[PDB]
Design a protein around this nucleic acid. Structure first.
Lengths: 178, 260, 143, 56, 132
RNA sequence: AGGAUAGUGGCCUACCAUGGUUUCAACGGGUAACGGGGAAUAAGGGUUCGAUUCCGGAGAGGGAGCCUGAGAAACGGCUACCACAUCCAAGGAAGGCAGCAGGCGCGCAAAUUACCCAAUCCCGACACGGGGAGGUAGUGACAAUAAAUAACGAUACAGGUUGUAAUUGGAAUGAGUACAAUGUAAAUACCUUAACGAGGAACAAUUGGAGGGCAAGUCUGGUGCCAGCAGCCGCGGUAAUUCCAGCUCCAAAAGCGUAUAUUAAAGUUGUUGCAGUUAAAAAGCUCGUAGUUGAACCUUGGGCUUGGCUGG
């Protein structure tokens, strides 16, 4: 038959289900960023856990090693590109110092709210899901869309959205049309 | 099991064809021909995946049935004809001549050549021996049999085939300092000069080759193809890159400068 | 020297000694002897269907005092007879003689659970309908 | 043992209907509800924090 | 409303007597552009016969306002009828959909004929003699 | 030495020697054993799995023997026997789904007797025919990805310039439905998109729990060592924080629980890395072959010249 298509899990659950310190930290972190559930926090921790694992393996290698220089610079470049890592912290030792709030800062939902396009973080998610927000000239309705540094300046209302110069929506057309 | 196989699963095809996993279950099984299955490039892959002249396998057969495609100066209508190293592909409708030479990345480059160079080819001498009625002959790497060769020609030499009469123009003896391309292994596609040939009776002889950047590598004698009489004097045009292997960091640096 | 060989050429002694001593591990021993295949009523399966022979009340062990209401079930796959607990207040009335019941373990992996003596299985479904669905009046027994 | 008393307590439990109540919000809204209820308008009893205080 | 067509990755293909390219369609305030209308527009742009133009494989981007597909322009209508697939000519009205029985019926008829050696006329003539 | 084979060879035959394997485990037995690439879990070392998308092998109900052919000991080829099993006018004849779909049975356990050669490729005398190979759709909570179930104002209050708790508004949107176009071999669906499509926005989120482990009640009613719960410890004998319910609350959520196996936890299999006085465990004591393991010692120092890379 046809070759199998690869797939993988993008999160991992905690080993201890009930822990007040972790439960309170997660809920506090979900409330700040308007997350739907704990899996959206597990996903960030999971992908951050493997960034650290890659950095740890390179840090065990000797300096000036060809693999450490090549993959280390590439890993740093990718994190700098999405704005998670600062431009003055390109050392692969600051990669280990990253925290989950650094990644949640770069979500589209967080950036819409912090750019003033929404009243609250929860207003940001519904604006995104309802096809009002466009990055560049492309409508993005994924709240977890990680905004790149070069995409930061091009976040705005979609040109065909009621809030961005489009026609009036379904509700208004029914009201002013009666 | 009871006879020859006639299918080729997509995942089991040679990796240098650069076929995608999900386009289907099967891959073109090269026909029997001058080149081995694993070291060949079927014309269907060349005309559809490389040149993108044909959009699918039905169209490449339409192209070849109109007598357009020539391999080594002869019209071929077999869509899975196993074209190989040093073969010349001519499409006179587009006025294009290609030679199948490995690039340094291990794949068959799309290497366009002039019409004057498309009038000949090189072949590595595999064996020299006497045929019936005591007539000596040479077997090249592409299965050609040339009778009455120059009595100085021996194995591992390279002959220049006129490719229109099939005769030998002249040859290059295998010796130190000759220009070489590697046609097998992980050093496939690299170009350098022979530094030292290390003999192993009953085993595999090893050849030490020095790159133009003074990088030295070792490969089996069976993967060595003499392509020039000395450094910087190849008998065919080399593909872009000149068979010089760059490290991944060097390639990344080169791509950054090329794109700004 | 810790009572085990340390020489660089003593891999055979170390490998054989571990192989001999894993037989003291009952989890390993039960897996290779195939005891579940040979001795277990389910034959190694997670579940097994059977026919209810009779409804029987079983007295709980001390210090508890109750009548644990189980059934006698003859398994279809091998004809063996086992006792299965019927959980939830009043679910014994959902189980009648000559009904087909799906059984499962108590989760103690072949041991009795709680104060119920000699019972290692529980009823999961009766007449093809979940016992939990019957208890919560989500479904009705097909009869 | 006698099987006659099966389902005794559940049968004689007085039936009480569930009081009709507004639906609670689902998804992201519910995390928002829990977050404010636990970290914005804190109801701590001077260091005494209870999720389900019984009426007393 | 101001449909804009861009062609990229253009390859001249005299082997199949056609020019082939990727088509970018900008159609703001428009669901999409029909294939029939693109063939009309492409014919005017490149001054070719409408029947020598073939487009296919179009998809609209997320959020709308733009579609991408593939297009072919043949040197003549005769060349198009020679190299185009049959199903595309039926799309363009240049050919009639061939009428055949369903795949089940064709196979069943083939297996029934496997039981007859010689002509059908002889087989039925012999059957009539046997039953008479 | 011959015969046979496409060919080597005790492959077989004749004659002749008495050899060959084995505690470094031969031989025999078991395997709920096709092998491998790989899979799960994993600090490291490991443990478990691999019928199953690729490669190799074997088989076509069980054996055996063959024809044709370059290639088969072929089974959608034949011959025979055994076991099943079909039609019969009773003389005879015809079989092989571990191909696709489908049926029975078995069971804890697994989908349509659908469309097509348009793609991937294969076969043929072949640009044209064929392909249940393959592709497309159907069923599909096996697993995996993203991701709705609401958002924002005003009053009224409480509250410390703003977070809510309620009753008052106007906006927004896709679930769904649909002109149409796209998609496709033709469709379906997706993506686009006219018109329709949200206040209890009934367009109503569930699954398990609330003594401890383990997050969340010493609330109310019922029963009274009964009914039942409870992985374990335990609860229940008239104010039960544990049963049956209502309320409230907790956890994960389009998912959640249960059973079984397995991995980590397990330094409870210990090479890394266990324990053996008394918790389990030093043979009663010596000898001893294999195995394992075995004291020290043989060109060291010195001198001169020079290449490269790190710091400056």
């Amino acid at each position: 038959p046809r070759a199998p298509r690869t797939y993988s899990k993008t999160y991992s659950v905690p080993k201890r289900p009930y822990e007040s310190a972790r439960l309170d930290a997660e809920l506090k972190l979900a409330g700040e960023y308007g997350l739907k559930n704990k899996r959206e926090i597990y996903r960030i921790g999971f992908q951050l856990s493997k960034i650290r694992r890659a950095a740890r393996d390179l840090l065990t290698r000797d300096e000036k090693d060809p693999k450490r220089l090549f993959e280390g610079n590439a890993l740093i470049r990718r994190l700098v590109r999405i704005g998670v890592l600062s431009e003055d912290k390109m050392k692969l030792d600051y990669v280990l110092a990253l925290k989950p709030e650094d990644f949640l800062e770069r979500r589209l939902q967080t950036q819409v709210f912090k750019l003033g396009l929404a009243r609250s973080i929860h207003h940001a998610r519904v604006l995104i899901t309802q096809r009002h927000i466009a990055v560049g000239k492309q409508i993005v309705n994924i709240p977890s869309f990680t905004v790149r540094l070069d995409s930061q300046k091009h976040i705005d209302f979609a040109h065909n959205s009621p809030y961005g110069g489009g026609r009036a929506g379904r509700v208004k057309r029914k009201n002013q049309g009666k | 099991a009871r006879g020859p196989k006639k299918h080729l699963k997509r995942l089991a095809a040679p990796s240098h064809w650069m076929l995608d996993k999900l386009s289907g279950t099967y891959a073109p099984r090269p026909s029997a021909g001058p080149h081995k299955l694993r070291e060949s490039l079927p014309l269907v892959v060349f005309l559809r995946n490389r040149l993108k002249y044909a959009l699918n396998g039905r169209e490449v057969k339409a192209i070849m049935m109109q007598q357009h495609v020539q391999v080594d100066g002869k019209v071929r209508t077999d869509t899975t004809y196993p074209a190989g190293f040093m073969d010349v592909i001519t499409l006179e409708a587009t006025n294009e001549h290609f030679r199948l030479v490995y690039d340094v990345k291990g794949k068959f480059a799309v290497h366009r050549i002039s019409a004057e160079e498309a009038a000949y080819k090189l072949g590595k001498v595999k064996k020299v021996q006497l045929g019936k009625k005591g007539v000596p002959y040479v077997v090249t790497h592409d299965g050609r049999t040339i009778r009455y060769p120059d009595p100085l020609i021996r194995a591992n030499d390279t002959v220049k085939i006129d490719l229109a009469t099939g005769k030998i123009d002249d040859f290059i003896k295998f010796d130190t300092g000759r220009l070489v391309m590697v046609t097998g292994g992980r050093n496939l596609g690299r170009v350098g000069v022979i530094v030292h040939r290390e003999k192993h009776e009953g085993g595999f002889d090893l050849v030490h080759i020095k790159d133009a950047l003074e990088n030295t590598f070792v490969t089996r004698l069976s993967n060595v193809f003499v392509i020039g009489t000395e450094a910087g004097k190849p008998w065919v045009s080399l593909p872009k890159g000149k068979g010089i292997k760059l490290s991944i960091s060097e390639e990344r640096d080169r791509r950054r400068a090329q794109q700004g | 020297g810790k009572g085990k060989p340390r020489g660089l050429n003593s891999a055979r002694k170390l490998r054989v000694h571990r192989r001999n001593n894993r037989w003291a591990d009952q989890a390993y021993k039960a897996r290779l002897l195939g005891t579940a295949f040979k001795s277990s009523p389910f034959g190694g399966s997670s579940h097994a269907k059977g026919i209810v022979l009779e409804k029987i009340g079983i007295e709980s062990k001390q210090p508890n005092s109750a009548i644990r209401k189980c059934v006698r079930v003859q398994l279809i796959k091998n004809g063996k007879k086992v006792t299965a607990f019927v959980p939830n207040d009043g679910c014994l009335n959902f189980v009648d003689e000559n009904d087909e019941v799906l059984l499962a373990g108590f989760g103690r992996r072949g041991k009795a659970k709680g104060d119920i003596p000699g019972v290692r299985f529980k009823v999961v479904k009766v007449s093809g309908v979940s016992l939990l669905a019957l208890w919560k009046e989500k479904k009705e027994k097909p009869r | 043992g006698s099987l006659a008393r099966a389902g005794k307590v559940k049968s004689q439990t007085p039936k009480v209907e569930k009081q009709e109540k507004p639906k609670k919000p689902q998804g992201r809204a519910y995390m928002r509800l829990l977050y404010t209820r636990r970290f914005v308008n804190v109801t701590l009893t001077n260091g005494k924090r209870k999720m389900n205080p019984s009426p007393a | 409303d101001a449909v804009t067509i861009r062609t990229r990755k253009v390859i001249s293909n005299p082997l199949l007597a056609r020019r082939q390219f990727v088509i970018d369609v900008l159609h703001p305030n428009r669901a999409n552009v029909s294939k029939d209308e693109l063939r009309e527009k492409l014919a005017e742009i490149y001054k070719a016969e409408k029947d020598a133009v073939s487009v296919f494989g179009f998809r609209t981007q997320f959020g709308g306002g733009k579609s991408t597909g593939f297009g072919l322009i043949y040197q003549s209508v005769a060349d198009a009828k020679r190299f185009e697939p049959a199903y595309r000519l039926v799309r363009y009205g240049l050919a009639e959909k061939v009428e055949k029985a369903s795949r089940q019926q064709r196979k069943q008829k083939k297996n029934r004929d496997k039981k007859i050696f010689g002509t059908q006329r002889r087989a039925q003539k012999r059957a009539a003699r046997r039953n008479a």
